[PDB]
């Protein structure tokens, strides 16, 4: 007899009184790339020649990850 | 007998009193890429020659990921 | 006997008192790409030569991902 | 007797065998100015808040400046 | 008796066999200026808050400046 | 008796066999200025808050300056 019975009662929580006055001001820039050949196969993930800017301000932004497995 | 019975009662939660006054102001830039040949196969993911800008301000933005598996 | 009976009663939740006063103002830029040959096959995902701007302000923006699997 | 008799027989000269293959490619940018009061009077020359690009390719472009003065 | 008789037979000269293959490629940038009051009078020359680009390729570009003066 | 009689027979000269393969590639940058009051009078020349780029390639680019004066 096999019984699998994990119990989860957890909390991930935040409080923030006021969130703001955020300034993001990058001063440009320059990028150059040279190549002759590219050859990509099974599950390649790639990024060539970027100049990318991100502002990310979540009011919460909490994460939880679970993985429940049984196997014979 | 096999019984698979995980129980989840978890919480992911947030409170934010006021969210704002966010400024995102990038000053341009320059990108150059050279190649002769590209050849991409099974599940390739690619980005060549970008100048990309993102502002992301979710009021919550909480994440939960689950995976429940049984296998014989 | 095989019983598969996961129970989920979990919550992903947010409150935000006021959301706004967000400014996104990029200053242009320049992008150049050269190649002679391309060949893309099974499940290729690609982006060549971009200058892309995104503003994303959801009032919630919460995410939940599930996967329930059984196999013999 | 007063005699004013300058003699000018001078030359300003050029030769250029071939002219070209010139590239001018700026990557944008960002400019901000704040003030409350302006007051400009006699022979003021002014420029507030600029993002200006110039390409200038004259085949000659030679200059000669003269000033001849007499006074009693 | 007053005689003013300067003589000019001078040369300003150039030869250039071929002029070219010139690249000017700046990567953007950012400028900010604050003030409350400006007050400009006799013969003021001014520039506030610039991001300016110049390419100048004259085939000759030679200069001569003269000033001939008499005064009593 | 007053005689003023300078003689100029001078040469300013250049030869250049081939002029080129010139690259000018600045990488952006950031400038900030704060002030309360400015007050400019007789023959002020001024520059506040610049991010300026110049490429200057004359095929000749020779200069001569003269000044001939008599005074009583």
Author numbering:
A (entry chain C), B (entry chain E), C (entry chain F), D (entry chain A), E (entry chain D), F (entry chain B): 307 to 378
Paper text:
0N3R and 0N4R versions of PAD12 tau were expressed in *E. coli* and purified, followed by *in vitro* assembly under shaking conditions (**[Fig fig1]**; **[Fig figs1]**; **Methods**). Assembly was carried out with 500 rpm orbital shaking (2 min on; 1 min off) for 7 days at a protein concentration of 100 µM in a buffer containing 100 mM potassium phosphate at pH 7.2, 400 mM potassium citrate and 4 mM tris(2-carboxyethyl) phosphine (TCEP). We used cryo-EM to determine the structures of the resulting filaments (**[Fig fig1]**; **[Fig figs2]; [Table tbl1]**). 0N3R-PAD12 tau primarily formed paired helical filaments (PHFs) (66%), with a minor population (14%) of single protofilaments with the Alzheimer fold. Because tau filaments from AD brains contain equimolar amounts of 3R and 4R tau, we also assembled a 1:1 mixture of 0N3R-PAD12 and 0N4R-PAD12 tau under the same conditions. Again, we observed predominantly PHFs (59%), with a minority of singlets with the Alzheimer tau fold (11%). The PHFs were identical to those found in AD brains, with a backbone root mean square deviation (r.m.s.d.) of 1.4 Å (**[Fig fig1]**). We then used a biosensor cell line that overexpresses hemagglutinin (HA-)tagged tau297-391 in HEK293T cells (see **Methods**) and compared its seeding response to increasing amounts of PHFs made with tau297-391, PAD12 0N3R or PAD12 0N3R:0N4R (**[Fig fig5]**). Comparing the recombinant PHFs of tau297-391 and PAD12 0N3R or PAD12 0N3R:0N4R tau, we observed efficient seeding at low concentrations (∼5 ng) of PAD12 PHFs, whereas tau297-391 did not lead to seeding at the same concentrations.
